[PDB]
Design a protein around this nucleic acid. Structure first.
Lengths: 642, 642
DNA sequence: CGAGCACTGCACTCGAGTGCAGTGCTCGTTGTT
DNA sequence: CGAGCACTGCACTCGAGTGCAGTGCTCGTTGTT
């Protein structure tokens, strides 16, 4: 064969793309265009080493990356590649679970418990027993459990005691799996575990897929957890081969449970395995690439890597030291406002912080100078309340056991159903181990409820069965517009605040637009499909009419980005490195890897700043410059006695 | 010794007064002077036979009688006569019970239960099980109960089961007894029975009394029931010499338990007991006595007698056959209208009827002619609702277990202790066998009652306890004045219609005066005393300004009276004899006796009338003259063709 | 400091209880303590 | 004829349950699916 595939790469990359079929690692750099090498490795497995698209399987963490993945593959391999699996660990585990739902013990219409829902269903359960009041907040409960699923530990697994400190939780977890089951719901963290668990109870399947997907890819491997690794390991027992990109230096998701180890753990658990070091940056200047290396070398146990450019060396890394953040910002604004004055495109920037709280003062400085911008704060469409109300009824329709959907929209729009009443259904639901709708069917037959109550409560349940019916044989975007009206939510929202509700309604109708444009082989009804598309990805926040404007965001939400001009605010001991990390955890190296990520972000200039004084909520305060600025080859940096 | 206890008597009376201490029967026949005989005999018993006022016991039936009896004895015995027990059965009975409450198995503060009280208490019972629904009518239950005690039976006596009919009642009677026993309530029948039983049970007391009361005297003996007869026999073992007085031909209270036979029963149970007949009548003309003797001879089984006189024959008994009762009345009025014109007094004329329904037509007729009149029926003071009411709070203060007092004032004035709430308290009492106040302490304690219910119920209770408290040191009348005020009773009646409302507060005021003049003699606490004298004698109607008026009453309540002029009305077969007395049980002879009682009430002229047609509730009916008219010797009756 | 959420007054809803008029259907007597 | 009497049929009281807007008082990483 000929190669129009490689001619666009450089030996290193080229070496990886053309690599023999077998296990390996592709220690990506940071301007090494790792997506590219991946886009081509598949172009190769199908072209050169001639493998069927039905054996290839890419896997990403974000839907966005794994989607832009599917794109380029299609722009290279001119067409569509059926049989292939390019998704997230989650969406892919889902894919399996929906298919072999039976095997894994899951109703074909199970529902994905998102963050908020899971937390609530927890706050609710904690109460049906002990007393949360700081003693057992819901969050730590959420944490403890995910932490467990991140480790593939079901209730009856982690034995202990002598310390009820743990046992207590151990019990709550028990309930959670119980409650979530009866309801027929599963959490993000569940998909993975439930899936992997299938390959340990349904071997003949485990075979089937190895027996198929003999080629596997896994982007950003430094961010996997112990149950993800353990899942993949099995897909490629021996028969299957597997490439894995990654980079231990950019594993700032250790708290989310990302075993920065695993990268190495791979080389070992997999005897035969090579290694490639794409170390050529095409994103930033040499002056910058340097600062990175020294700085990033202050860690240890690394695999080490020298980041080299082939372009210029560019301007130094100016350093400011304002009296207070009021200045620190005002400085940056002027430093950016000048960039603009000089045909500078305000989108080619990015104030980066260690804590979202740091952004407020940045905005006032900005707005105090006719300069648009836009934070990347969460709150994606499908997370907004008005929408989860809407989708909650829909869930009740696809299933009357969505304990989460129920306890949410049961008395919303307020339909005269108070807690005194609900607390009964709970204590019922709880003591008789039932879903809520189940306790209702009972508490009504048993006629053990107030006249007022039962009559209202019941008025509710009928409203649902009513909607399930009245809309059944309907097309999504119509069934939706109905439920929105017929549940009185629209009504509930046309009567809401000033600036507030005005959007609520709009978001609702967009929910319809959206629904009228949702697309998807048949293996689930157009709703259950949607309700899943809703849980597994939200995204949206009002893509500000491009009218050129700044880019504010924490560092964690900046990985994968690059901007001509870039800044890092709050460069001082306290925030960076963090307080709750300079002491709270000894996870000090992470904070470094981050700064490393933050720098591998600049393209031309790069500015680091910090103030002597700043009010960390409430009282006044003074820190000392970040230990990070010092570990920088001093010839790169440049003070600014402004 | 000299005699002036005799010179005023007639040969026959003397024969009785001076008779020797032994058992005799003075068969007095109306106009006989039986009261005089009883009085002189007693004076004789002390004066001539030298018995002590402590060995003599005169038993009458009405308080009225006893009173008169007493007055006269002291007029002949120009003094006091302490020690003498002169009273009505019930009265005496009760005296004993209070004195020997202990051995009688009764609280020293037992409360007499009057008719309303009794009847209502049953209504609750029957209802607290059975269905009054004409199948087990309270009246019928009551009737059975007293018919039982007149006979001195008891629940655990007349055993049965061969018909639930007598068995249900049997049960009802059972419930009733425990209820009364638990409440410290004794009914009129109980008074007598108990008293008898006490003598059967504690022979050492009977003895005391036999030893003391060696001289019995019983008035109106043909009206005695069995229990009374029995009671008389014991106190008259073999040592007691008893004189009875009465007339078997004037026995008109059979339906109310009287046993006319007891007159002959006295002659058998005590042989050698001779008989003296008082036959010289001093009230009516020879012509009237004449018809009398004939009318009555139609009954058989009598001891017979001949009412004679040493006076004029007088005008004959006249008859008027009115077209209808509207005319009959008119007629009577006219006849009376003459008598008066001729200087006669209206008060010396009496219209007599079999039924009370018969007075309206007459009152009207009397009205129509500006003829003043007074009707001898009457609501009695201590029966008036506003008086039992008032007395019920006082009762609750003496004892919280007066289930009757309770059930009465509990929610009147209305206090919110609504009905539904009581059915609970009622039942709770049934199932657990407790007083209504008892069953409350519990329902309130066990917190088994609703908020409202419990709260009101409580309010009432504390009030009673409050009045009890604030009143313990107050002289009866003050206490009564406060309970009437503070129980909210006054305000209630101060705001009642206008007709009733006005009289009512006034009666309530009379009550305070009453309790103020009340006089009793260390034996019982004032309040307990009064409450007793309030149940044993209710007297009073409206002591009408002695404005000359025509006398209206029934033959029954006419007995013992006398008038120059009398008019018996509606001598129509069906009316009199009453229809009830033609089928109901061969109680014909009694109806004749009734007639006999009527004729003998006239002094000068007796007039008998009867309509051909009359309206009898709704319809017009047509009766035939009473057979009684016939039975009158022709020589004494003169038609009256107007 | 602003963010969030028990956490608490306070107006309301609502229906079981109250309290009392309405309606339809008997079937009738005498009355002290 | 109507008194007595279950019942049914309001209108009303009243307190348990809602329905929300308003004061505070704790506690502060990072964020995909």
């Amino acid at each position: 064969d000929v190669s129009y595939l490689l001619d666009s790469l450089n030996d290193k990359q080229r070496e990886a793309v053309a690599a023999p079929r077998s296990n390996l690692l592709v220690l990506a750099g940071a301007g090494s265009g790792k997506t590219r090498v991946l886009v081509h490795r598949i172009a190769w497995l199908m072209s050169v080493e001639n493998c069927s698209p039905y054996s290839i399987m890419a896997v990403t963490f974000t839907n966005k990356a794994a989607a832009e993945m599917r794109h380029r593959i299609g722009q290279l391999m001119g067409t569509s590649q059926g049989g292939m699996w390019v998704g997230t660990f989650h969406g892919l585990a889902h894919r399996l679970l929906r298919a072999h739902h039976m095997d894994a013990n899951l109703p074909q219409d199970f529902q994905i418990l998102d963050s908020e829902d899971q937390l609530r269903l927890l706050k609710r359960l904690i109460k049906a027993m002990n007393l949360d009041e700081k003693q057992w907040p819901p969050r730590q409960a959420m944490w403890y459990i995910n932490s467990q699923k991140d480790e593939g530990l079901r209730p009856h697994h982690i034995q202990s005691y002598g310390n009820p400190v743990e046992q207590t939780w151990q019990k709550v977890y028990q309930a959670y799996q119980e409650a979530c089951d009866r309801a027929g719901l599963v959490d993000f963290a569940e998909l993975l575990l439930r899936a992997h668990e299938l390959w340990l109870n349904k071997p003949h399947i485990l075979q089937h897929y190895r027996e198929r997907f003999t080629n596997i890819l896994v982007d950003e491997f430094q961010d996997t957890n112990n149950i993800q690794y353990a899942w993949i390991r099995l897909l490629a027992g021996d028969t299957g081969k597997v490439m894995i990109v990654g980079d231990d230096d950019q594993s700032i998701y250790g708290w989310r449970g990302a075993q920065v180890e695993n990268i190495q753990r791979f080389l070992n658990d997999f005897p035969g395995a090579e290694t490639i070091r794409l170390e050529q940056n095409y994103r930033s200047t040499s002056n910058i690439l340097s600062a990175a290396n020294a700085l990033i070398e202050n860690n240890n146990g690394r695999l080490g890597k020298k980041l080299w450019t082939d372009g210029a060396d560019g301007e130094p890394i100016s350093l400011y030291c304002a009296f207070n953040e009021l200045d620190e910002a005002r400085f940056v604004v002027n430093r950016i406002k000048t960039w603009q004055d000089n045909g500078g495109a305000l989108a080619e920037c990015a104030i980066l912080y260690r804590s979202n709280a740091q952004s407020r003062v940045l905005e006032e400085a900005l707005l105090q100078a006719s300069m648009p911008y836009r934070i990347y704060g969460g709150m994606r469409f499908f997370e907004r309340q008005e929408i989860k109300d809407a989708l909650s009824y829909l869930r009740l329709i696809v299933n009357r056991n969505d304990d989460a959907a129920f306890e949410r929209v049961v008395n919303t729009p307020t339909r005269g159903i108070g807690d005194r009443t609900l607390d009964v259904v709970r204590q019922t639901s709880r003591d008789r181990q039932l879903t809520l709708w189940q306790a209702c069917r009972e508490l009504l037959q048993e006629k053990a409820l107030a006249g007022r109550a039962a009559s209202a409560l019941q008025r509710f349940m009928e409203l649902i069965d009513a909607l399930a019916q009245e809309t059944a044989d309907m097309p999504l975007h119509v069934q939706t517009d109905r439920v929105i009206k017929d549940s009185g939510l629209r009504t509930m929202y046309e009567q809401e605040k000033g600036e507030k509700g005005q959007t609520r309604i709009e978001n609702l109708e967009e929910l319809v637009t959206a629904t009228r444009q949702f697309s998807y082989d048949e293996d689930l009804m157009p709703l259950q499909a949607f309700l899943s598309h809703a849980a597994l990805e939200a995204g949206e926040g009002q893509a500000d009419t491009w009218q050129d404007a700044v880019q504010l965001m924490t560092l964690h939400s900046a990985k994968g980005l690059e901007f001509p001009q870039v800044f890092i605010v709050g460069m001082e001991e306290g925030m960076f490195p963090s307080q709750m990390s300079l002491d709270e955890g000894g996870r000090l190296e992470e904070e470094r890897r981050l700064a490393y990520v933050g720098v591998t972000r600049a393209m031309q200039k790069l500015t680091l700043t910090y103030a002597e004084t700043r009010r960390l909520y409430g009282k006044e305060v003074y820190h000392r410059p970040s230990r990070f600025i010092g570990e920088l080859p001093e010839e790169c940096v440049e003070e600014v006695r402004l």
